[PDB]
Amino acid sequence: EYLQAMRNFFLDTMYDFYTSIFDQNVSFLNVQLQELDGLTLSYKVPWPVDIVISLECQKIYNQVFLLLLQIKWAKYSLDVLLQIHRMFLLRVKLMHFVNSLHNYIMTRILHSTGLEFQHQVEEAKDLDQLIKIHYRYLSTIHDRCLLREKVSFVKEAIMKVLNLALMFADGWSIEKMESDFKNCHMFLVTILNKAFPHLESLALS
């Protein structure tokens, strides 16, 4: 139940938590939770649960929570509407991709491993192997989500394609966005072809 709540706090209430951030005091947002990069926050973990839950645990989840907030940030900024026609193309050239990225982050990483890990810890009968499967879940999400290395040629592309949505949201000139976009898209698909062994599922998108 703590594991379900932990993936509920890092990665309902979170969209309210971010619509506060959309336009600050970060302890106010903690109380709002209790009912593009940067920023840290902590919450206390009780001791008999904190001896089977790691400390490196919190860091690894805080990284992907910031990533999910950036994903929803670009998805919300890129919808700003409810030559004059040209702006429309710079929606869908962008609106799909940060969304297709959302198909790879959610299902392929945060839904397969996240669902199997909760099932794995329920069947453990020993105290050591529950910690070991937790650490091997942390390492395999450290490999699936790229936090390690080659993250100055891959993760910066992921950041800057969300930055393009911010630049379109301000602009609501247009022709100077797609030249950057196709360039970083070509770099991304030439790197993510097989060069961890599951990144080809986004290179076809």
């Binding site: 869908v92 799909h96 839904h111």
Partner: protein, 420 residues
């Protein structure tokens, strides 16, 4: 986020009452509102947390010359809702003129229900085009929602009048209301009388009581589309983020709605996706192809099958789309509701934008033009005369839907730097 159903039209009030009894059976609640002993999950999308854990549904009942409220009054659903939300013709113009004079108190009703909710994000409409009382009053309500709330959503779950050429006044009303739905509504889920009636004649053995089973079909469709909002998943559970992926083309916001069980009385996700892309399983009626596809699968699902199904669906070229961007078919997962009284919990839904609906729209673009040339079916009603002296609003609606047709055909092209 939280959306409030505005029911209008005779079939609109029927699907509203059917939707509330469907949600009463779906959730673990009494017909007074009290929590049961078999019901934490969220019950805050359509229900206010009232007094004794009374999950009172937030709704607006609008009509003219009341008929169905008597059936509400002698039922236990006058003890579930109505703390005061129930408000008491045959043409678009008569309904427009009748809604003009009482716009103040119906806008006060909208303000009262907006103050009643805790997080207003959109106004969802359970409406029937040319239902009688719904025509005209619904379009004027859409104009009022567009003028007063540009910052909120307008969602329209609606059926559109197609009889395959019955009533000779409904193409004018449907084309005018369609122009109002393009300019004054934010998303339209389109349904048809012939498509639902044909599938009802296929899966059952009826032909005359079409309304009572169309109520069941539309209620199941609406519950399936709001399943991920009512019961917590973790993808795009606000209405804004959910419809954000659903509309690829900003003027073409009419969405296909399929449903893999036509009757709910094993299967893999590959087979129901192959089923679900076929138009025979869709309840919606040359080069036609989608622009962007999304499907939602809820049931006893294995997620690696969602992987392999998406792989094989996009590679075998059954997702048919030639866009001006990269816009594609999308998978989405949902949790099936705990304590459904329904069995066979595997169910699928698709929300996709297809250009083939333009052809159905072209039938309406034929019909009004045909009925403008014969000139015995505009009927020369005086309310239509005081609505517009030149009768150029119908020509404006025809121009808007002609732009819509050209925008569908331009979205088939890899260029949208030019539409007609």
């Amino acid at each position: 986020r939280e959306i409030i159903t505005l029911q209008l039209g005779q079939c609109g009030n029927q699907i509203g009452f059917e939707f509330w009894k469907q949600l009463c059976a779906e959730h673990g609640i009494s017909p007074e509102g009290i929590v049961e002993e078999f019901a934490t999950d969220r019950k805050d999308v359509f229900f206010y947390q009232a007094d004794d854990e009374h999950y009172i549904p937030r709704a607006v009942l609008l009509d003219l010359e009341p008929r169905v409220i008597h059936s509400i009054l002698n039922s236990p659903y006058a003890k579930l809702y109505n703390p005061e939300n129930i408000y008491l013709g045959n043409n678009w113009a008569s309904g427009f003129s009748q809604g003009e004079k009482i716009h103040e108190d119906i806008f006060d009703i909208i303000d009262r229900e907006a103050d009643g909710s805790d997080s207003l994000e959109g106004f969802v409409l359970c409406h029937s085009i040319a239902g009688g009382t719904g025509s005209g009053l619904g379009s004027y309500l859409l104009e009022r929602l567009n003028d007063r709330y540009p910052k909120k959503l307008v969602q329209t779950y609606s059926v559109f009048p197609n009889q395959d050429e019955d009533v000779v006044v409904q193409p004018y009303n449907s084309l005018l209301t369609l122009k109002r739905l393009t300019q004054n509504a934010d998303c339209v889920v389109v349904l048809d009388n012939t498509a639902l009636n044909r599938i009802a004649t296929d899966r059952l053995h009826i032909q005359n009581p079409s309304f009572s089973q169309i109520n069941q079909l539309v209620s199941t469709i609406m519950s399936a589309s709001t399943t991920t909002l009512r019961y917590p998943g973790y993808m795009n559970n606000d209405l804004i983020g959910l419809i954000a992926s659903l509309i690829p083309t900003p003027r073409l916001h009419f969405l296909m709605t399929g449903y893999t069980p036509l009757t709910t009385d094993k299967t893999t996700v590959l087979d129901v996706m192959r089923r679900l892309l076929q138009p025979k399983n869709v309840m919606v009626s040359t080069n036609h192809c989608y622009i962007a596809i999304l499907n939602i699968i809820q049931g006893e699902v294995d997620p690696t099958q969602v992987h392999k199904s998406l792989q094989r669906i996009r590679e075998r070229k059954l997702a048919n789309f030639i866009p001006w961007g990269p816009a594609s078919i999308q998978v989405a997962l949902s949790r099936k509701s705990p304590y459904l009284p329904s069995a066979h919990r595997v169910s699928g839904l698709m929300m996709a934008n297809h250009t083939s609906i333009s052809s159905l729209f072209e039938r309406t673009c034929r019909q009004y033009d045909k009925l403008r040339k014969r000139e015995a079916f505009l009927e020369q009603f005086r309310k239509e005369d005081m609505f517009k002296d030149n009768f150029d609003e119908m020509d404006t609606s025809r121009e808007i839907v002609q732009q819509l047709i050209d925008e569908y055909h331009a979205a088939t092209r890899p260029d949208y730097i030019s539409w007609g």
